[PDB]
């Protein structure tokens, strides 16, 4: 319904938050690893019944009190470890999400030639198995010239995590540029292009992907359901992690950003608009990738389910493959990788704006604010240093370990702990009134049943059956060794143990010197809790 060109700019500014590398890069690869038919039902169930409720909760919780992901734990000071856990998640994201941007900068710079290198098998990195889309009987185990460019030129992939080999100086140069553009923007800190350029660019590659032979096999493998893979806890863990991750849940940036939002803003409306358009965008970005896998399937002579069973890298095997079938091919490659760059840098900007803000709110005001630039610089320096091994010859083995464990189901359990802490310790009764003070209407009954019963029930059983059914992680038939999966668990629970660790620390610091009344003193709200100066029904 028409609104004099004003509200449509609020829609397009919202749309620009929904599209990101969390769905242009991350959704298709998980969707393939789980096998599309199996992933789509769990993804929708977890997004409807858990993700959207926890997204709206994190927005409201921050907007109401108007405090960052740490200082909002003034409802129950004992649980401030949930906020520190969200900073451990945010610091695992920042280091690896810049090497996803290295690869984007490398393919963007690499597109500055007369011929795209990944188009043919006539290059020195290529094996005898290279099939060639444009290029006797040769091979039993054929490969795409784009799989070999990725695996043997971009990243000279070692056979193991232990073989760090040598650092990829071109990718490390891109890590430098990536961290500079980020840091420089945090000093400088038009909508239409940011919010639409991804969609017109995805539509070009989609209309291309649809017209290729065998695309329907890829689309069919994407959409026909697998009601046979349904009891695998890993599918529900991955689907839950993607439903929470792609919305920004348990990165803590949501709360911190919402703290700047107007007290009477409609965070219900903004949660539906962002999450519904994010859902659709993910399904679209996945559709185009699968329409390309359908083409690689008959081009290589194998079942769609085993064409390119990667992790990170699917978007750097598949989108490159499709670009070589477009006319004026390098122009669209430059525009495509520039779209990925400006999608990625936009989330690093919001992540690092958050991370610095929360670290400042935690400390004595004047000197830490004089240090604002120096601390942002310290984060970008430390983010480059911790990124070096991901540019090593073993890099993506660690990239999949951080993304599949440190930044996966940990987001779901950290936000489940918040869900129960607010609903049962603070009290749903008290919280729904707090929402009603700023929206004017109570939460829809759907969110009331979801927060109180569904979300802890679903999350609890996915947690239990994942522990029962766990299998060693594999990147495309490289099976990870015993020490590596042990580091995976340590990164995964490094952010969760922050909760009980702070609980021990407060139960030591707090007054009481008795068994349980000190836990009651530690769980009830702070005297400073609630909104700023004027906005009090109780105060």
């Amino acid at each position, epitope marked *: 319904r028409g609104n004099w060109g004003n509200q449509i700019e609020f829609v397009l500014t919202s749309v620009g938050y929904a599209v990101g590398l969390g769905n242009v890069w991350r959704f298709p690869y998980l969707c393939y690893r789980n096998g599309g038919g199996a992933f789509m039902f769990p993804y929708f169930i977890m997004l409807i019944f858990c993700g959207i409720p926890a997204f709206f909760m994190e927005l409201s919780f921050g907007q109401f009190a108007s405090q960052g992901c740490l200082g909002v734990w003034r409802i129950s000071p004992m649980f401030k470890g949930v906020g520190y856990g969200m900073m451990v998640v945010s610091t695992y994201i920042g280091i690896y999400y810049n090497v996803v941007i290295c690869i984007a900068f490398y393919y963007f710079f690499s597109s500055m030639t*007369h*011929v*795209l290198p*990944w*188009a*043919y098998c006539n290059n020195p990195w290529n094996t005898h198995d290279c099939a*060639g*889309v*444009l*290029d006797l009987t040769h091979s039993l185990q054929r490969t795409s010239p784009s799989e070999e460019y990725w695996r043997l030129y971009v990243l000279k992939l070692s056979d193991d995590i232990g073989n760090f080999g040598e650092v990829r100086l071109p990718l490390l140069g891109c890590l430098g540029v990536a961290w500079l553009v980020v840091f420089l923007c945090l000093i400088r800190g038009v909508v239409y292009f940011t919010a639409t350029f991804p969609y017109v660019v995805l539509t070009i590659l989609f209309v291309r992907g*649809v*017209t*290729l*032979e*065998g*695309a*329907f096999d890829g689309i069919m493998y994407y959409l026909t359901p697998q009601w046979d893979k349904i009891l695998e806890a890993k599918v529900w863990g991955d689907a839950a992690s993607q439903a929470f991750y792609s919305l920004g849940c348990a990165w803590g940036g949501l709360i911190t950003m919402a703290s700047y939002n107007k007290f009477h803003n409609n965070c219900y409306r903004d949660s539906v608009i962002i999450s519904i358009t994010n859902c659709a965008t993910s399904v679209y970005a996945g559709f185009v990738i699968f329409s390309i896998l359908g*083409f690689m399937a*008959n*081009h290589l002579g194998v079942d769609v389910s085993r064409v390119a069973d990667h992790g990170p890298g699917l978007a750097f095997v598949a989108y490159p493959e499709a*670009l*070589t*079938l*477009l*006319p*004026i*091919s*390098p*122009l669209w490659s430059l525009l495509f990788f520039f779209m990925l760059i400006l999608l990625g840098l936009g989330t690093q900007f919001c992540l690092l704006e958050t991370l610095v803000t929360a670290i400042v709110d935690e400390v004595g005001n004047e000197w830490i604010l004089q240090k604002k630039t120096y601390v942002t610089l310290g984060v970008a320096v430390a983010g480059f240093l911790l990124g070096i091994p991901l540019t090593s010859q073993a890099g993506i083995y660690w990239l999949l370990l951080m993304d599949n464990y440190a930044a996966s189901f940990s987001l779901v359990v950290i936000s489940c702990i918040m869900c129960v802490a607010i609903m049962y310790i603070y009290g749903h009764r008290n919280y729904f009134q707090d929402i009603q003070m700023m929206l004017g209407f109570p939460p829809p009954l759907f969110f009331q049943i979801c927060w109180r019963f569904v979300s802890p029930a679903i999350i609890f059983f996915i947690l239990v059956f994942t522990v029962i059914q766990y299998q060693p992680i594999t990147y495309n038939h490289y099976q990870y060794p015993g020490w590596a999966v042990a580091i995976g668990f340590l990164m995964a629970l490094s952010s969760v143990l922050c909760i009980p660790l702070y609980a021990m620390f407060r139960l030591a610091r707090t007054d009481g010197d008795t068994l349980l009344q000190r836990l009651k003193n530690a769980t009830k709200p702070s005297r400073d809790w609630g909104p700023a100066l004027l906005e009090h029904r109780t105060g």
Partner: nanobody
Amino acid sequence: QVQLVESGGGLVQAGGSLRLSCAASGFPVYAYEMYWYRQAPGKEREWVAAISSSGTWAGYADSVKGRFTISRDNAKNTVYLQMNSLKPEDTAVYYCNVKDWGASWAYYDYWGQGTQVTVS
């Protein structure tokens, strides 16, 4: 390496039908859009039709729409132009074409031998 060889031309009366075949070899033709053109006597080489890699989208010249049907059989490495409701102005040398962009800023048009159609 790339070769294109058309067949199916000749004399036909107005209101008649012909099916031109183009046999393609020397490349993975399933990856390419295929095109048809015609060169009428005393006239410049004109576009007639195009077909997607899978045959999902098929496009035609405004003076041909609804009269000719383009189709392909990627197992045989062929593209066909089914010509119906032929009229004298359809008299031309019909050429089969593929444009290899080579993952570059330009294309090499590869041309078939040309097959004459003559409509009385």
